[PDB]
Amino acid sequence: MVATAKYGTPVIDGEIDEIWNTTEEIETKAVAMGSLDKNATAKVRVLWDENYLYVLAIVKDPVLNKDNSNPWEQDSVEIFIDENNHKTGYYEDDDAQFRVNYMNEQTFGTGGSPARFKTAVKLIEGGYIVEAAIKWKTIKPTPNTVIGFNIQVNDANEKGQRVGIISWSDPTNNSWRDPSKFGNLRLIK
């Protein structure tokens, strides 16, 4: 429900900056489809500065696949932001869904834009690391500012079928259209 992100500016390249160690790690344990022991999950660290929100997601996934024509059905990570944290039941102008797969290919849901999304992906033993920067659209964050946030891992099998949907705050697979399913992220100094 609630987490924090330390102020900081990491380099987007898929490598783990020392600074990521200064912020808490959250886990995607809100299951909508699949299970924690059998499907893709991520260990996530979050940082922020006046211009972007930064996300480091270490994904556990032994089988990588992107054969499905649906981007949400390819092994990928989705990031959700609610800048004014209104927790509405639908997307406002400030709300957004961003997506990037293990090949660092970006796709977008409502509100998401490539002009505000920089990403890098590096494969690792047993999975992959996603490092992203999301440019704020409507706000200029200050310490103790609270935004709505969620991160989801889509797990596809060798058959190109999505078998897992696990996020941090949403076990109902509605984050793509319902910000009220996002958790709260306090931007701290």
Ligand X SMILES: OC[C@H]1O[C@@H](O[C@H]2[C@H](O)[C@@H](O)[C@H](O)O[C@@H]2CO)[C@H](O)[C@@H](O)[C@@H]1O
Is residue 63 a contact point for Ca ion (CB under 5 A)?
yes
DSSP H/E element including 151: strand 145-156
Is residue 173 a contact point for ligand X (CB under 6 A)?
yes
CA angle 129, 170, 91 (to 5 degrees): 95
Q: Which of 95, 107, 132, 185 binds Ca ion (CB under 5 A)?
A: 95
Q: Which of 26, 121, 153, 165 binds ligand X (CB under 6 A)?
A: 165
The closest residue (CB) to ligand X is: 109
Reported as half-sphere exposure (CB side, CA atoms, 13 A), residue 105 has a value of 12
Judged by CB under 5 A, how many residues of this single chain contact Ca ion? 14
Classified as helix, coil or strand, 131 is: strand
Residue with smaller CB distance to ligand X, 33 or 188:
33
Report the alpha-carbon distance of residue 131 to residue 121 in Å, rounded.
6
Is residue 178 a contact point for Ca ion (CB under 5 A)?
no
Report the alpha-carbon distance of residue 23 to residue 47 in Å, rounded.
7
- Smallest distance from ligand X to CB 1, Å: 19
Is residue 155 a contact point for Ca ion (CB under 5 A)?
yes
Closest among 11, 38, 13, 32 to 78, alpha carbons compared:
32
Residues of this chain that bind ligand X (CB under 6 A): 72, 78, 97, 109, 165, 173, 175-176
Residues of this chain that bind Ca ion (CB under 5 A): 11, 13, 15, 17, 61, 63, 75, 82, 84, 86, 92, 94-95, 155
